[PDB]
Design a protein around this ligand. Sequence first.
Ligand code: NI
Length: 341
Amino acid sequence: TCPFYKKIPGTGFTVDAFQYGVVEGCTAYFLTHFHSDHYAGLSKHFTFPVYCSEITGNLLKNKLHVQEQYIHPLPLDTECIVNGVKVVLLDANHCPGAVMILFYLPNGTVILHTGDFRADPSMERSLLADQKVHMLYLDTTYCSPEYTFPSQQEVIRFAINTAFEAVTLNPHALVVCGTYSIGKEKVFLAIADVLGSKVGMSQEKYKTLQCLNIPEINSLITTDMCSSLVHLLPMMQINFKGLQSHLKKCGGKYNQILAFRPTGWTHSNKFTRIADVIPQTKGNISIYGIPYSEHSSYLEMKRFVQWLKPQKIIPTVNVGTWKSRSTMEKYFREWKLEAGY
Ligand code: NI
C-alpha cells in the first residue's frame, strides 16, 4: 500500500505513487520528474489524471505512450487550481522538467514537496519566500556530512578544458560521454560546443532529447554518428572493452577515445579537488570519472532547510530502514537547534 510520505494530507492527491495500482481516495496523481523509480507503474494502461511539467508530459506521451487525455501539463511559477486546491510548480534544479510542488491547503497549511532537487540559493528568492511553509517533503539522498561535491560549473569547466586539449593534440580522437536516463545533458552539450560538433547518439536517445524543450536542439544533436566527434553511449559500455569495440565500429575515422563517466558521489570526494583529477588509461583509451551531481550536497540541503524553517520534515529518500531514519532525525534536530526554529 501507498506510503504516507507520498500522500498530501487534506487532499485526494498523491506524488510519485504509480506502482501501487489504484490508490483509494486519490483523485489526482502528480509526477515530479521522468526518472523510472518515480514513474514506476505508469504505462499506456493508466487511466487517471496525471499532473506534471510540460517536459514531463512530452516524455509521458512519447516514451511511455500514456494517452493524451490523462496528461495535465502545468506551467512553472504560476498559481494554478487543481481539483479546488491552489498549487505552484517550481524548478527543482534536477533533470529536465523536474519540479518541486507547493500545495496551499484549504485550512491554510502550506506544504512544499521537493521531488528530487539540488538545493540552490536562487530558491531563496522564488515564490517560496512569500509565506510560511509548515511541512516539507525532502529529498534526503545525501543527508550526511561526508557528501561534498564541486559545483556543476567547476565540473563543466574541467570537462571542457580536458576535451579541448585532447582533440587539439590529436584531431583523430573521439570524445564519448556515458548516460542512462535524462539529466546531466550539460556535460555532453558543453564538450560539443567547445569542439564545434553536434552530439551523435542512438535513435532511442535522440527521441528522448527531442522532447526536452532545449532551444536550437536541431543544431546540437544528430543520429549520424559518422558526422560527429562527440558520441553518447549507455553508461554500461564506458570501459576499455566497450570503448575499443565502439572504436572498431566507426570505420577507422578515429584512433583514440577520451570518455567521461558522470557519476554521483563515490569515496574519493573526501580528499581530491576537481583540479587534481587524473584518468584511468589502457592504451589509446582514457576514462575520466567526474562527480556531476543533480542532488543537494549536505551543505546545500542544510542551508535550504535552515532558511525555510519548516515545522515538520518528511524524508522521501532512504526511508526503508530504522537506522537511516534515526540518523536523519538527528541531523534535522541539530539544524533546528542551531538556527532557532
Ligand atoms: Ni531523480
